């Protein structure tokens, strides 16, 4: 259905360590396909997915060029930032920027992304209208005015509705079996006694893609939040994701609990119960 392409930039100044470090990563949905590290032994755009690895040399040369350009841009923005917040050059700071596009079902731009934060806090972000900007503080308003003066939202929007979507479609075509694939989660319920009166029920969902998934517990068919623990969705390391949800249950009440898991790859929602 809906797909997306996102780029994540992280620039960290290193007073004394010389130039700031720039790290860029590219994602199609939940699949990383490219990377760039200024601290790599030979800085260049690298393939992290099989379906982008066979792109001609021009792709990698241009990609590298743009990556380095972005790096320098973030350096200049780091200096400008030091000057906006009146900070010392002996201190370390961070600039993060995520930007991308969401290809909808009708092959048209569904949503656009262009947001940047300074030192882990919102700095300036492109609004849903794709016309206006939102500045977090008085320092970001300078940038906002600068970008309003040079029609940046318009131009970047031209990028969004054009090149971005084009390349996204190209990737989706070349990586058909991988990107347009929806792997269902291999699930199972485990039992772990805490004492002689209580026992933990843990619902496992493994090796699923994409990362989006819903996992809950129900007592007597009623939603349960009390005495429950859900861990953050974690990567498997092979391109898949994992997640489990546990609940503390009185001994003898086990068969009254059910784990519910919904995922894109699931033909039908799952209703699981402890199967000793």
């Amino acid at each position: 259905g809906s797909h997306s392409m996102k780029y994540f930039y992280t620039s960290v100044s290193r007073p004394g360590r010389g130039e700031p470090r720039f790290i860029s990563v590219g994602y199609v949905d939940d699949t990383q396909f490219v990377r760039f590290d200024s601290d790599a032994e030979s800085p260049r755009e690298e393939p992290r997915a099989p379906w982008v690895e066979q792109e001609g040399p021009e792709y990698w040369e241009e990609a590298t060029r743009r990556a380095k350009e972005a790096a320098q841009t973030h350096r200049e923005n780091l200096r400008t930032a030091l000057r906006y917040y009146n900070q010392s050059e002996a201190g370390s700071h961070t600039i993060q920027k995520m930007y991308g596009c969401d290809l909808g079902p009708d092959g048209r731009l569904l949503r656009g992304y262009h947001q940047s934060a300074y030192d882990g806090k919102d700095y300036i972000a492109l609004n849903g209208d794709l016309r206006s900007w939102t500045a977090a503080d008085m320092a970001a308003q300078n940038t906002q005015r600068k970008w309003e003066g040079n029609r940046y939202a318009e131009r970047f929007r031209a990028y969004l509705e054009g090149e971005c979507l084009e390349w996204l479609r190209r990737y989706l075509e070349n990586g058909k079996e991988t990107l347009q694939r929806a792997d269902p989660p291999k699930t199972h319920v485990t039992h772990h006694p805490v004492s002689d009166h209580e026992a933990t029920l843990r619902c496992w969902a493994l090796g699923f893609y994409p990362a989006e998934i819903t996992l809950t517990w129900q007592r007597d068919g009623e939603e349960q939040t009390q005495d429950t623990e859900f861990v953050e969705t974690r990567p498997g390391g092979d391109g898949t994701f994992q997640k489990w949800g546990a609940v503390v249950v009185p001994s003898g009440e086990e068969q009254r609990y059910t784990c519910h898991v919904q995922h894109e790859g699931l033909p039908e929602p799952l209703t699981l119960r402890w199967e000793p």
Binding site: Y99, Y123, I124, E163, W167
Partner: peptide
């Protein structure tokens, strides 16, 4: 692909 252009704060 990546975006090209000047983006100064």
């Amino acid at each position: 692909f990546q975006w090209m252009g000047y983006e100064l704060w």
